């Protein structure tokens, strides 16, 4: 599995981005997909994630009504759709994917995988 | 798959079909749940109030650590190898366990190492003053305090220390803390032997914080749109991870999933009705969820889950089998449904699917006003169906409808089906049933042996 | 009709006939609950706490609006015709749905042209400021507002508020509503998805106003002795009739039920006692209540029902069906009633009806003090009756009792009776008594089929 | 006794053999509920809503009173005799009463003697100010009396009688005793037909006193470490002694415990797992808790005692029989043992017992780090046993574990048994099952009867 | 069906009255009889209720332990004594019959029948 | 059923005694002990009790840690330390047995048995 971030830059404050993540491979189709970002001088944060089917999505509340996500399972991709960004938004955004499970609420070293990450900056 | 409408004929109606949906993929916050509240506020009016609750809630917290402390020692890190990185289990001095509580031991040891940093804020801990309050667990982190009593103890008692007298405000305080503790023994008294399980909804948790979970929730910034399900499915989960018995909080580990739907699955409900035979009034007797996978057909506790309008949440799979002489059922030979007499005055007498209403007229005065003249079954018929194309707009009972157009087979009203064996579903009569069967076999079976015997 | 004496000698006693009643005709009256309370004595001090509180409870009422949408725009009143008067359901446009949900479709629209008199006092509505108000609806007529948390608000923060910082009220609000919010989700979350139906019953929809149903019935104005039987039975309810997203207030219609008997019905209640066979003790397996209309015999599903000390209150008709095997023990014949071995150390061992004592005095020291004499069973008599013609004074354990007179036969101590098969009721038990049959009928049925086939 | 090396392979592991306790020889001690509470610190702003409250509450006292005058009244002490002394009961007047409920009428006059020593204090009762309070029976007795709200009015009414108004002091009380009122119905209302029974749990009469049950049970001044054990038992309990309608207070003995441990008892629990069979997974159904006495095996229905990690306890004996087919299972004979087929995805695979792991690892990955070779199972085997003698650390899914060695027979994993029958447990397949072997067996009992009649 | 109210009249304060109906037909051993009152200037309020057999009633809070209400089976009418009137009490009183039913809460079109009428008035 | 209590005496305040109370016949591994005291002018106030098997045991508040009590099955004895005995522990104290019973949480003329009582004493 590879996946590869693209489409970062710099935007002016209250400006927007469309963040786009690249699969690889058949079984695109089972992996719960989500991203992370980290500002610099802070841990690695959640930002939102999206089932398999593009049906539920979640958030953290930090950024609720301001970012959306979708998926496409014919391009194999995941979009990330950002507005009115805040000077405090700069980060690394990385890509995340997870194989799906059930059953047991914990699932011994499932097997995560991440993008290579992607610069975004915002000017005031 | 299933034949519907040869279904249909022995008092079934195709109810709505939803979709099967069930947890997936939680992520995991932590947050310390702190038992005693602070009263340096007040403190020349709490006397000794304060060293018999001490006395008393040590003793029920103490029993937990000592369970949780099995695996929190006697697992190490693995060591010697790089193909591999992991815990390693002490299974010789575990001795007796189930796969799932081992599966939670091996959880436990990795939150133990994140469990350790909030360790180092004891201080703070043990100096909160609101009911919840934020601290710096790095420069990097934050960690969340929700405290017991404290906006009790802020609103009521500090504010009325000039006016009530010392010895009744200790006594009022003594009050609240008796009422907290005759709460939380029925969530962490000695129904709670296992604590290294990670099953326990957070709804029983949050007994610890006077089940105020709305709060418990919203400090952990998740938002989504499936929350009240998530909520209410029981999906939303947390362990206790940590215990320190001198200062009285636990740390607790809170599980959030996100939904998956399954392909290829889906519940059909279906809609029972009355119907006559004879002059008597009958109810079939089959699963009323039938769940389809890849097209097999199996047979749901439904019990566990959520029927929602459009969908079933499950905290987990609760498919189970069927036996085969009932999908014969399902699969259209009506010959198999057992059914139930009718022997209460009120049992539903019709229904609507589609538009089209089937009726057990003979027991309810069908009609349609667009001729008024009056609808009838004869007695060799189970049930009618009626729409727009015998009557565009009928009565039953005084309710009024208007119908619209069956898309099935046209003759329906004329065909008529086998009917099945009939059946009594009280657990007394069932006791009875299998002795009856018993001595009927009996009597058959010492035929074939004397025959045999004594003709050999 | 039931031959008690016979079926007494298999372990069972005669109890009290009770009188069968259950709910009929109820009377209706609207009721409007406001779901946020009001703050403008203190509002400085809200902050941001009221925009949160109605940004979330609006996501739980909005979904139970959109599913009452559905039966209240999709009907019409009827017209062109004099001959009925009524309401006409666009069936084509609600699909599916339940005989029983499209009559409280009726109801709803029925009562909706009521609630529009409510829906003008909205601006009062809002301007409530106690927790019990009443409004002129018009010169004619009132109605009664409840509000959520008024009374916590004007009690505890309004007088404190010199006190307490603005930071700390706010705070101690925010813990209130959250609170509140916590408890309100177990009934209005997503396990109400059919608010369409009239049949919730009124403890329930009182969790909207803190469980303290009693003022929202006191507010009714109803008088009757009844008051307590119809609460317990759960046959008071109440209806969702209308729900406004711009002010949080819902309007709920209670019915209020008055009983009737039935008549020529009546309940039976049988008391179990084990008795002696062989050196075994046994007990008799039969329904313990049983159900007589019009001399037919029938079973009821008591546990739906209130057992009083006169008569059964049921909210509505729970009679089922009894297998005609089990109707032959209570109809005299002893052969087909099944009894299942006693093995626990404690079971009851004797009883009173009538004041004669039924005792299984081989385990228990029965004996008389007028004489001093002992009372001994032998192992051919499965009970002994005990009254003043033998001895006017017995001795069970040590609880000494006067004894009348036996109205039956008098030989009840030399008759002795035929017992029946024994049977088995664990649910484990019956899973492997089932297969156990099918295995012995399986070598039984081999044979038949070989003789036939081979030895034709 | 039980064959756990053969039972084992049909998927049963050995679980934690359990010390078998229950109840025994109670305590009595007496105490006074005030159900009404004191307000002459605010009288001037009470109106009549005391009026109304004492109007209703009579209304639930009286029918409790009533049910325990009868008892109360038809019994009288023994005179005439010297070699016993008791009481004697008018069992004519008594009528029908259950074994339990006579016996329960004796501790109530053995009770009503002391119970009028307190009835002298009614003088001191009325004037009580404090939620709790403790009086002088006689210089050489002390009783405790324990107020409903005292506390609430105590607290928060009698310090804002100046800030808030007369009128909404008056309505802030109304709420309180009305929300009181609506609790207490659950508990006091008509359930509560047989007031003389001394089995309600006193979780149950703390519903008097705002569910406080904790301090309801410090002023017994009892102490012990099983505290925590006898209240989630259900084992402690109180019983109405008196009540009095003109002062509305009611007197409960209260009955604490001592747990005793029986002789050569012990409940052995058996953990399922999963295992193979040709190529479908099957779980054998067997009774999950074996309990042995003396050697015999009897079935207990566990699900009313508490299973602690060391012992059960039990407030009475809870054994019940046992079928001799399912006995044979535990006594080695695997052919009887009924096995039901899995579908569901998620069910156990392995467990763990005495360091030895038992697995389905067709299901699971077993393997072993030692040598990197995975553990592989033929289609012959049902499960695997994987000690340190076949590898010392084993791999599960991810999960690491170090085993120890087996005990029992060196060829476990190469003898393979004979598996049982099949077996379907939902309720509605039961329903079908019955009736299809009905079917079955009629179309065998003609052949019987044509051949004997017609052939004859 | 038909129904027919008598006694009505004038009564001093605190006076009292025996509100007679009177009934027809076979079918009155299954109707739930009761009485309704019309106050000038208002709508109809509820005044009391009572079962087929007599043995259960219901009546609003405003009458309790004023008015009382009782049913005979065999003369086929219903009385109502009312004590201590009050001059609020002046009303038309109406008689009402309501076949029983049971099962669900709510019965369409559920055929009522109401008397004819009758005047009571109280002076001061 | 015999039982005969023995070690009183008197002892200065914050002392210690082992009374120690014996038995008769082989029944004596069934019965529940226990002591009770009587002090000048007081009721009979209970002390301690003791399952058969000495695995069980309860006691009053007034006198946790304080006392503590056991018993021996071969010697068919029942014995209780007392420690830092103060002045108001002056009682005649009276050996308890009584037969194990369960099932009924009463039990009518359960017959118990009591000791001759002995004397304790504590000087300041
Ligand atoms: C409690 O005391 C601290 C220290 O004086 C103070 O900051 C806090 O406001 C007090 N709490 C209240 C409710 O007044
Ligand atoms: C784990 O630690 C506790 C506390 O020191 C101790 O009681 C326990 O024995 C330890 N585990 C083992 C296997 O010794
Ligand atoms: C009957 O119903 C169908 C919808 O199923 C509708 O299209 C058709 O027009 C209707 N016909 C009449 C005569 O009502
Ligand atoms: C089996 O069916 C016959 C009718 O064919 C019926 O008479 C009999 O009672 C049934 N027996 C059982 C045990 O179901
Ligand atoms: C709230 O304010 C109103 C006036 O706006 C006042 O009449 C009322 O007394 C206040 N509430 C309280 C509890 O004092
Ligand atoms: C009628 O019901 C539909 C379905 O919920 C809704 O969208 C619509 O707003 C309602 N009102 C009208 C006037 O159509
Ligand atoms: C026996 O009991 C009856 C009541 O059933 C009573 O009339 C009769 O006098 C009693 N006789 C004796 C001797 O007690
Ligand atoms: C049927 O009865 C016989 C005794 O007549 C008994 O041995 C057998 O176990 C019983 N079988 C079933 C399935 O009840
Ligand atoms: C109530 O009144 C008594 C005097 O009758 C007084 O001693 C007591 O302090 C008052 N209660 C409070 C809470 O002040
Ligand atoms: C005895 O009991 C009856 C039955 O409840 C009761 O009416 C009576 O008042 C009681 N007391 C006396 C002295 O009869
Ligand atoms: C195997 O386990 C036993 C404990 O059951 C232990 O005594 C023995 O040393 C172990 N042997 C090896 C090689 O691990
Ligand atoms: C009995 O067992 C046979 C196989 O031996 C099976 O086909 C049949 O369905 C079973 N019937 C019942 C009623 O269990």
């Not at chain 2, 392909?263 to 389809?292: C, G, K, M, R, T």
Request: proline fraction near 3%; charge should be neutral.
């Amino acid at each position: 599995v590879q996946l590869v971030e693209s489409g970062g830059g710099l935007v002016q404050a209250g400006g927007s981005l469309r963040l786009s993540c690249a699969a690889s491979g058949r079984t695109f189709s089972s992996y719960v997909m989500g991203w992370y970002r980290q500002a610099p001088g802070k841990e690695r944060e959640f930002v939102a994630r999206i089932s398999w089917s593009g049906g539920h999505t979640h958030s953290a509340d930090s950024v609720k009504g301001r970012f959306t996500i979708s998926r496409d399972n014919a391009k194999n991709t995941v979009y990330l759709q950002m507005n009115s960004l805040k000077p405090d938004d700069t980060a690394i955004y990385y890509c995340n994917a997870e194989p799906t499970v059930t059953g047991s609420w914990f699932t011994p070293g499932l097997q995560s995988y991440w993008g290579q990450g992607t610069q975004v900056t915002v000017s005031s | 798959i299933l034949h519907y409408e040869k279904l249909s004929k022995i008092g079934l109606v195709k109810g709505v079909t939803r979709k099967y949906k069930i947890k997936s993929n939680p992520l995991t916050k932590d947050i310390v749940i702190k038992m005693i509240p602070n009263v340096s506020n007040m403190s020349q009016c709490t006397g000794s109030v304060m060293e018999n609750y001490k006395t008393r809630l040590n003793g029920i917290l103490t029993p937990i650590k000592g369970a949780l402390e099995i695996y929190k020692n006697n697992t190490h890190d693995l060591v010697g190898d790089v193909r591999l990185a992991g815990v390693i289990m002490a299974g010789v001095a575990i001795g007796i366990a189930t796969a799932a509580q081992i599966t939670a031991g091996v959880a436990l040891y990795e939150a133990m190492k994140n469990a350790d940093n909030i360790n180092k804020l004891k201080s703070s801990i043990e100096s909160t003053n609101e009911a919840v309050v934020k601290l710096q667990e790095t420069a990097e982190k934050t960690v969340y305090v929700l405290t017991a009593l404290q906006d009790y103890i802020n609103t009521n008692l500090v504010p009325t220390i000039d006016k009530i007298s010392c010895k009744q405000t200790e006594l009022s305080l003594d009050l609240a803390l008796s009422k907290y503790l005759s709460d939380l023994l029925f969530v962490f008294g000695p129904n709670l032997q296992d604590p290294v399980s990670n099953s326990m909804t957070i709804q029983a948790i949050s007994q610890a914080f006077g089940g105020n979970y709305e709060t418990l929730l919203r400090t952990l910034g998740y938002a989504t749109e499936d929350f009240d399900d998530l909520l209410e499915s029981d999906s939303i989960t947390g362990q206790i991870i940590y215990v320190d018995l001198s200062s009285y909080y636990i740390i607790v580990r809170v599980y959030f999933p996100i939904l998956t739907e399954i392909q290829q699955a889906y519940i059909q409900e279906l809609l029972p009705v009355s119907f006559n035979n004879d002059n008597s009034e009958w109810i079939s007797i089959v699963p009323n969820f039938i769940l389809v996978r890849n097209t097999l057909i199996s047979n749901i506790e439904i019990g566990f889950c959520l029927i929602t309008k459009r969908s079933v949440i499950c905290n987990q799979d609760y498919a189970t089998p069927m036996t085969n002489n009932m999908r014969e059922c399902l699969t259209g030979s009506t010959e198999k449904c057992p059914r139930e007499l009718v022997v209460s005055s009120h049992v539903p007498r019709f229904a609507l699917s589609n538009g089209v209403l089937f009726a057990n007229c003979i027991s309810v005065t069908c009609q349609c006003q667009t001729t008024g003249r009056a609808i009838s079954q004869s007695g060799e018929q189970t049930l009618l169906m009626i729409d727009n194309t015998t009557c565009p707009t009928a009565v039953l009972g005084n309710v009024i409808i208007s119908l619209g157009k069956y898309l099935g087979s046209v003759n329906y009203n004329s065909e008529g089906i086998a009917i099945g064996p009939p059946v009594f579903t009280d657990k007394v009569d069932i006791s009875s049933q299998i002795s009856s069967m018993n001595q009927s076999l009996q009597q058959s079976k010492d035929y074939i042996k004397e025959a045999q015997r004594l003709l050999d």
